[PDB]
Amino acid sequence: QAVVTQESALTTSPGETVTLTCRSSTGTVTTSNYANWVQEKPDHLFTGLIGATNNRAAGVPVRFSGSLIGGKAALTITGAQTEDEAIYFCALWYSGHWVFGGGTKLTVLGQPKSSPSVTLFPPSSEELETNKATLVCTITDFYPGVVTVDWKVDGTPVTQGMETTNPSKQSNNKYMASSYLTLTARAWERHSSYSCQVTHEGHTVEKSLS
Template sequence: MNALEGESVTMECRYSRKTDDRYLIWGYVPPRSGAIQGLVYWSPGSRIPTFVSGKADRYEAVKDFARKRMTLRIVNATKQDSSRYFCQLTDHQVTDNRTDFCSCGSTLNVQAVPPSSPPSVHLQYPPPGEISADAPTSLLCLVTGFYPPPVQISWYLDGSKVLSGISEWPLSRDPQDRYTSVSRLEIRSRDWVDAGSYQCVVSHPKLKQPIMKEIRTSAHQETLVN
C-alpha cells in the first residue's frame, strides 16, 4: 500500500467469530526491529479502543463486530509510518513485543510529496472521413503530467460554455505520481458541421492562466489551435 505524506491511510482487517469474547489487536514492526509491537487493542465485548502508548496521536481505530471487521486509520501520514502492520484475534492482551502474529500483514510505504507540475493538454478529434451524418461523434481532451490533482476541464462551443454531453474518466496516476484526466464531449454530426469552433479549457493551480485548445470546423476544415 502506497501513500503520500499528509494523506490519510485506512487499513482493514476481517475476522470470523460468533462471540465477541476475544481481544482484537493492531500491531506493527517499529523501525530497526524484528518484533511486532502492539499498537491498539479492544478488550472482549468492548467497542472502545485502548492505545498501548496511552494516546491516540494520529490514529483512529474502529471495531465493527457485527460486520466482523476492524479498521486502523492513520491521519496525516509521515515517512515514519512506513512499516508492516498486522492484526490479530487472541484470548490474551498484548502490549509487549510479540512474534506470534499471523504471517499476513499490510506493508505501508509513505513517500514524499512530489513537486508540483503543470498539465499538458491535447485535443483529439475524429478525422473527416469518420464523421457520419447519422451518428454522433466525440472530442477528447487529454490532460497529462500534472500534480497535484485535480484539474478543471471545461468545454466551449463558439465561445459559449457547453453543459451537456460531457463525461470524465477517473483520474489515473503514473509511477512518478503524475496524474492524467480525460474529458469527453459527445456531439451530433450536424453540430460538428455547423459549428465554428470547439474549445477545451483547462485550469490548474500551477498555471498562471488556463490552457485552451481549439478545433475550428468552419469551411469543413479542421484546424487545431494551441
C-alpha cells in the first residue's frame, strides 16, 4: 500500500506563513484521498484540524487551511501562532483504508534559541561489578527541540549500542533528551576516550571522558 511522507520538522516565527506537505508514494494525491490533518499537542491530545482535503473542523482557528499542491496535500497556517508548535500528521484515505504520514514537528519560535547544556557521566563502580557499563549523556534546556547526538570511542564513530530518547518538553518550554552508550565492563576497560557530541542549530557541543 502507499507510503505517506511529510517534512520531519519545520521552524517558523509567529505571524508568518508556513506550509506543510504530504505526499503519497502511489503518485498523486487527489480529492478522493480526503486528506486529513491531525494535530498532536503535549500529553498525547489529538485534534482533527482539517478533513476532506480542505474542510476545516468546528472551533479550529481560521488561519489553518488545506489544499492540494503539485500532486500533494498541504496545510498552510497563515499567521502561525506560538500555541501552534506541535506535531502535525496527515492521513490519506485509500478506498477504505487510512494511511498516516510520519508527522511533522513544527516549531514556532516562542523564545530565543537556547543551546543544549550537556553532561556526560562515567559508569559507576557498582554497575561495573555487574560486568556492564552505561555511559549517560544528558542534554537539557535546548530550543528549538531538535538535536543530533553522535558518539565516539577512541575517535571512531560508534554504530551500535547507543539509544537516544526523543526530545521531551520541559517546564520552561525548552526541551531535553538523554543518550546511552552500553558497553561491557571489558570494553570499557579496553578504550581510553569516550565522547558525546550534540549538534543543535549548526553548532556542536562535545563532552568527553578519558
